[PDB]
Design brief:
part of a larger assembly, 8 chains, A mainly alpha, B alpha+beta, C mainly alpha, D mainly alpha, E mainly alpha, F mainly alpha, G mainly alpha, H mainly alpha, A: mainly alpha, elongated, G: 3 helices, binds cardiolipin, binds 1,2-diacyl-SN-glycero-3-phosphocholine, binds 1,2-dioleoyl-sn-glycero-3-phosphoethanolamine, binds dodecyl-beta-D-maltoside, Letm1 RBD domain-containing protein (chain D), transmembrane (chain D)
Chain lengths: ~60, ~140, ~100, ~375, ~80, ~55, ~55, ~140
Amino acid sequence: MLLGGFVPRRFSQFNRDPCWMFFIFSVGFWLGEYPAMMIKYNARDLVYDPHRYVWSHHDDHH
Amino acid sequence: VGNGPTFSTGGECMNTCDIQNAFPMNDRGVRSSSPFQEPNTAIYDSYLAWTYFQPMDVHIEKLPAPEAKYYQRHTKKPWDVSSTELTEIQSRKKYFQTLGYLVAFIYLYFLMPKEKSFSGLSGPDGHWIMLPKGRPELF
Amino acid sequence: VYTRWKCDRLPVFQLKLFTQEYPMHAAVGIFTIIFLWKHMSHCSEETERKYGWWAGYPYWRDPIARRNETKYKQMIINNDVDITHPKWTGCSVEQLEELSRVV
Amino acid sequence: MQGSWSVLKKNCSNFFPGLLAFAQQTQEAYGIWLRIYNRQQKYGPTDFVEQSETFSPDYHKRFHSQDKNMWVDKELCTEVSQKEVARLMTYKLDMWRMAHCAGALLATGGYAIPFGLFWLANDTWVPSSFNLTGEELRAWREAQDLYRYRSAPSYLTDTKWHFDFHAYPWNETQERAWDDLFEKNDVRRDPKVVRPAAEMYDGFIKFELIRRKSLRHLCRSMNIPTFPMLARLCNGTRVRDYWNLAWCEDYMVITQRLHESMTDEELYDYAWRRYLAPYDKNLNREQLMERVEDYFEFLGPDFVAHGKAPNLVILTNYVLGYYNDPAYLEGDISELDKNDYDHLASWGKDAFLRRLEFENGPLRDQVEAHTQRLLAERAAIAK
Amino acid sequence: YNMLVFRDPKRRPQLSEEERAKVVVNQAEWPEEFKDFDPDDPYKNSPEIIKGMSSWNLFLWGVECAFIYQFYELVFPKSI
Amino acid sequence: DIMVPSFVYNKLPVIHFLQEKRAEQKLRRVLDETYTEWTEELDQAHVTDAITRSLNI
Amino acid sequence: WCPEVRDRAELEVDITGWQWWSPLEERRLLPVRLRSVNEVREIMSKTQAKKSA
Amino acid sequence: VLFSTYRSSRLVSKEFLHGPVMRFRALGEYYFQRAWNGTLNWALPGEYRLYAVMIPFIYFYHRWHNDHTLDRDHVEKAMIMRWGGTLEDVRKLSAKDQLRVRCFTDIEKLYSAYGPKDTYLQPPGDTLPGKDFYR
Ligand SMILES: CCCCCCCCCCCCCCCCCC(=O)OC[C@H](COP(=O)([O-])OCC(O)COP(=O)([O-])OC[C@@H](COC(=O)CCCCCCCCCCCCCCCCC)OC(=O)CCCCCCCCCCCCCCCCC)OC(=O)CCCCCCCCCCCCCCCCC
Ligand SMILES: CCCCCCCCCCCCCCCCCC(=O)OC[C@H](COP(=O)([O-])OCC(O)COP(=O)([O-])OC[C@@H](COC(=O)CCCCCCCCCCCCCCCCC)OC(=O)CCCCCCCCCCCCCCCCC)OC(=O)CCCCCCCCCCCCCCCCC
Ligand SMILES: CCCCCCCCCCCCCCCCCC(=O)OC[C@H](COP(=O)([O-])OCC(O)COP(=O)([O-])OC[C@@H](COC(=O)CCCCCCCCCCCCCCCCC)OC(=O)CCCCCCCCCCCCCCCCC)OC(=O)CCCCCCCCCCCCCCCCC
Ligand SMILES: CCCCCCCCCCCCCCCCCC(=O)OC[C@H](COP(=O)([O-])OCC(O)COP(=O)([O-])OC[C@@H](COC(=O)CCCCCCCCCCCCCCCCC)OC(=O)CCCCCCCCCCCCCCCCC)OC(=O)CCCCCCCCCCCCCCCCC
Ligand SMILES: CCCCCCCCCCCCCCCCCC(=O)OC[C@H](COP(=O)([O-])OCC(O)COP(=O)([O-])OC[C@@H](COC(=O)CCCCCCCCCCCCCCCCC)OC(=O)CCCCCCCCCCCCCCCCC)OC(=O)CCCCCCCCCCCCCCCCC
Ligand SMILES: CCCCCCCCCCCCCCCCCC(=O)OC[C@H](COP(=O)([O-])OCC[N+](C)(C)C)OC(=O)CCCCCCCCCCCCCCCCC
Ligand SMILES: CCCCCCCC/C=C/CCCCCCCC(=O)OC[C@H](COP(=O)(O)OCCN)OC(=O)CCCCCCC/C=C/CCCCCCCC
Ligand SMILES: CCCCCCCCCCCCO[C@@H]1O[C@H](CO)[C@@H](O[C@H]2O[C@H](CO)[C@@H](O)[C@H](O)[C@H]2O)[C@H](O)[C@H]1O
């Protein structure tokens, strides 16, 4: 019902309560996974599967 | 003073509730969070207003202990279970239920394989049951 | 004092709740359960192949065929069924032997 | 009362003698009821004999009407004695329970045997005839009183809560009557003060409009079996018949002052059948006489004058109020010196709890003043 | 103030202006955690749960966990 | 485990308040029924006068 | 340690009385309070006059 | 007579496992039994920290389940169909090849309906294997 509880004023205060510490850890995971996907899935050495035209979900569900 | 809880409020403001009259009002004009008398009751304003009571060390003139005759009522019945006993029972039951649910959650979301896998490496593909046995005349 | 929720045990309270508090709802629920298990409790093999698998039916191993093979082997072995009987084959045993020698 | 092996052995030993005694009582009670029914059919009012229909104003559902479908035979003493009426009432209770058991047996064939074992292990639903000695009868009466204690408070609370939530009394005297009606048995209720509640509830609800759940609670409190309850007009009929017999006997006693000459045990039984005197209270003759006189006073002069009793719902509440014992309280007051949340002491206070303690603690005024002054200064600077 | 949808509760004043003006403030009696108390930043001086563990350190820990989750298979791939 | 307990908890305050008011009403009724009964007794002057008359004075 | 409240609440809930507000009973009992001494004097005078008449 | 219908018929002593139960209740009560923890129909509490702690945990375990149990099936199907149509054929490949294929599947998932269609539509004149390669 969002009535009350500890509310950090800014980022630096997230370490003043264990629950908000876990919350900021989770936020870091969430936001840092995206750059990892950028680096991994836009890599120069990434190569499409040669047999990608052999089969696809589009023909399966059709 | 201790960190213990108090009479529950449900996140409601007693100065505007439908049963506000049941909550005593102190000198400052703040109705109590409980049927008891509270001197330091306060109101906090989030999106919704809610009443709060902060426990404190206060001395109250304690009337001398009466006799057991004038407050004890020995009308207990076999079916009767006291609130304290009920709380104990429920605490134990919920502890065991919590352990069981924790085990179940772990097994489901980290160990139990999904049925009917494409590769066949994990999970069962299903099978028949209730098949007849020792009934040659059936065929 | 006595109260059903506080004094009675869980099964007793369940029976009381669904017999003297919500009996009609329980009756309707049982009726609906019976209907569901009587008319919505079957799935053909083709339906299973189309929609019965998360990623699609793995035709490269055909687990349905293996399942039915195990079922029929178990039934035959346990019930002592002679699958060479003329009714199963539509021809006499001697004709079956002649066909085996032919092919 | 919970079942036990001793009671099981008692009932198993006395099973066949109990059945034989029940059959003899059945013959006697059939004779008594034949007399009573013939008298009712011959001298009864036209509405009572013809079973006049009284429908509710909301859903037009027929139910017995206290004024029309209940009749007090003032001249029944000529044909039937008070003791015969009491015997008939007791046999009616026993026959109801036996009939329910027999119906279960007929329905379920031989599969009711374990349920019969459960039945014989408890005296709650066995007939009085199964007790062949004084101690067994005392235990049986104790079980019946326990069931009454278990059931009555629910009925009283249902009535009181529904009325108070959906209506209020008109005048002060009605308010006092309503408040004093539902007092615990540890205090004595004045029937004169309580009587107007009957008229008030007649204004609210009559016996013809009694709801099925309240009827179930009442039948539980009257040791009347409720399963299968079925429609409300069956156990309602049972209740009407029982209270009509009780009213006839009460009129007979009042007119002939039989209770004064009635012996101690018979007086106790008479009060018990009215749900006035529990056996576990070990009441003496003085208390029994006081309660009986209060009951007669509650019935009022109009009962003798015209055979019209007050509202049956309020009468049942009043009589069952003697089974509404004070709420139990066990434990020395010293127990209040303990603490309930010691297990949380190890956790201490977090930042938010410390802030709340600081703001709302003994220094609350100073913090409030400082905060308000700072906010005012900031607002002034902003402007 | 607010942090996303979470709003900091504010205690309603209970004293009137006349009574409030007569209150003498003595911060010497206040706890060290709450001195120069500011409603807009009441937890500025609040102690850290773990000494030397900053919020940014936890954020970086989560980011490193994400990087591990996404890159471990690249270094230690496993067969089907 | 959850619902009935919560509603009982919600009921508690109003019932406590009403029962306190009822007890106060009982005490008030007890007090209001108290009246001091001042009795009047035959003045002894008449008795003295009768005594004088009996003496034939 | 306040058994009457407990019993009443439990019974009200067990009989389908979920509601926790009783405006009518409160209205009947809200203005109840112990009387002042002068009020007691007036009531006693009224009672004495009634008894005399 | 065999079993009691009343909860009052205890099966254990009042002190059985008192300490662990008290610890569990201390865990339960510290954050929940507060005035500001006003629930909405018992499902939505008023304590912010409860949200802050529970949302990430729920998401984490759900995502772990989905990744290691649900999408794995689709990934394996893609690998099998595109590289022989049999599990052994896929196992004939090296771990690095499987990694490449699975990451391409992740690429396809990310593109979804908002990306180039050459990932599954073979342009005319392309020299790569077609659908009948293994047939
Ligand atoms: C020893 C037991 C008693 C023996 C018999 C005694 C004497 C007779 C009793 C009364 C018989 C009634 C006859 C029918 C009357 C009219 C209704 C009707 O049309 O019925 C159709 C049909 C009966 O067929 P039929 O008309 O006799 O003729 C055959 C036709 O040729 C068939 O033609 P069809 O086209 O209708 O066929 C489709 C299919 C139709 O079948 C169905 O649709 C099945 C419907 C089942 C309904 C169950 C009702 C009770 C539900 C309680 C609430 C459950 C909530 C959800 C729980 C989910 C998680 C478990 O028919 C069947 O194959 C019937 C098989 C019925 C098997 C019943 C098994 C019950 C299992 C209950 C498990 C409960 C688990 C709780 C665990 C809790 C743990 C904490 O189904 C039923 O009657 C269903 C109700 C049966 C009730 C039996 C008595 C009570 C239960 C006793 C067994 C308890 C076992 C517990 C095991 C626990 C394991 C952990
Ligand atoms: C294993 C066994 C399985 C058994 C299955 C069978 C069913 C269960 C059996 C019985 C279970 C026990 C409990 C039953 C309910 C008890 C109710 C109660 O407490 O009543 C007290 C009540 C006593 O109170 P009272 O104060 O003396 O009198 C009541 C007051 O009048 C009350 O005053 P009021 O102010 O309330 O007055 C109103 C009152 C007035 O009513 C009464 O109370 C009077 C008595 C009832 C009269 C009913 C007949 C009315 C005239 C029918 C005319 C039909 C013409 C058709 C011509 C067709 C030509 C082609 O109520 C009405 O107005 C209701 C009228 C009935 C309406 C029926 C609507 C049906 C709609 C159908 C829809 C479509 C269906 C599907 C499609 C079908 C076609 C394809 O009892 C009665 O009055 C009679 C009770 C009768 C009990 C049922 C007997 C069952 C016999 C079963 C034999 C067959 C067994 C088959 C076994 C199969 C193998 C297993
Ligand atoms: C073999 C076939 C079986 C078929 C399946 C049966 C399945 C079981 C169902 C139940 C059957 C009955 C069980 C025995 C009951 C005992 C007899 C009796 O009525 O006791 C009086 C008593 C009457 O109660 P009440 O409330 O005082 O009556 C108000 C009247 O205003 C009372 O009027 P009143 O105020 O003027 O007072 C009169 C009173 C004045 O008298 C007295 O006061 C003297 C005492 C008389 C009664 C004595 C009862 C003794 C009971 C105990 C017996 C010994 C048990 C021993 C057990 C251990 C054995 C080792 O005398 C009476 O009690 C007379 C009542 C009217 C007669 C009812 C009997 C009708 C059926 C019999 C004839 C059948 C003919 C078939 C022809 C076939 C043609 C093809 O019965 C009850 O307690 C009621 C039964 C309670 C259980 C109900 C269960 C549900 C029933 C639903 C039935 C629906 C239709 C059937 C289909 C079912 C499908 C699901
Ligand atoms: C030789 C004798 C003389 C001749 C015979 C005479 C006639 C005798 C018969 C008549 C007797 C009538 C009086 C009876 C009184 C006693 C009744 C009673 O039971 O009292 C409770 C009685 C104790 O009474 P008490 O202690 O004296 O307390 C009485 C109080 O006053 C408490 O009182 P209360 O009022 O609070 O209690 C009432 C409570 C009574 O209930 C209970 O208390 C519940 C009893 C069961 C509790 C079970 C708990 C334990 C569960 C264990 C589960 C399994 C565990 C694992 C086992 C592993 C094994 C390897 O609630 C109810 O009354 C609910 C009624 C529900 C009615 C249901 C109606 C359904 C209708 C369906 C809908 C139809 C709609 C119309 C459709 C129309 C369609 C056309 O309970 C027990 O003793 C418990 C027994 C448990 C036995 C073990 C567990 C079950 C074993 C099953 C074995 C199955 C084997 C075959 C399996 C085959 C598989 C294929
Ligand atoms: C956490 C999980 C735990 C485990 C959970 C387990 C799973 C449960 C899931 C589902 C639960 C909810 C189900 C609800 C269904 C819908 C109910 C409904 O609509 O009710 C409406 C409605 C509600 O009843 P009510 O009268 O308004 O009040 C109910 C209150 O509970 C009355 O309360 P009260 O306080 O007013 O009265 C208290 C006291 C008041 O005292 C008395 O009344 C005195 C004593 C009376 C004794 C009984 C008299 C019966 C008279 C005849 C009744 C008519 C018979 C009709 C013909 C026979 C039909 C079979 O009565 C009693 O103590 C009653 C004792 C009954 C004990 C038996 C309870 C069942 C235990 C299990 C035994 C059977 C197991 C079979 C399956 C296993 C087989 C291997 O039902 C009725 O009108 C009753 C009709 C009864 C007809 C007979 C039963 C038909 C059902 C099939 C029986 C099959 C027997 C098989 C034998 C063995 C074969 C091998
Ligand atoms: C891809 C295709 C999609 C198609 C989707 C179609 C919609 C599906 C929707 C399903 C979900 C919603 C379900 C809602 C509930 C529907 C209920 C329904 O229709 O059920 C009917 C069905 C009808 O049953 P039935 O189909 O077995 O009917 C038998 C009729 N004969 C024999 C002629 C074939 O009910 C049941 O299945 C339950 C029956 C048992 C319970 C009732 C027993 C008592 C019956 C009393 C009358 C007869 C006996 C005499 C009196 C009693 C004597 C003791
Ligand atoms: C009814 C049985 C009749 C025949 C005699 C069988 C005796 C078998 C040997 C039993 C030895 C162990 C007994 C231990 C004490 C059991 C106590 C008991 O039953 O309590 C039930 C108790 C629950 O009690 P509440 O409902 O909470 O309240 C009870 C108070 N009303 O149940 C339990 O906890 C389970 C206890 C199970 C004990 C073992 C029972 C075995 C019964 C077997 C019967 C079948 C015949 C066996 C023949 C054996 C021949 C060598
Ligand atoms: C399976 C069925 C089981 C049934 C169980 C119950 C049976 C009860 C039988 C009761 C018989 C009573 O006997 C009957 O009583 C009535 C009332 O006195 C008599 O009735 C007689 O007097 C009345 C009253 O003046 C007249 O209205 C009536 O016209 C006249 O016949 C009958 O003449 C007599 O036959």
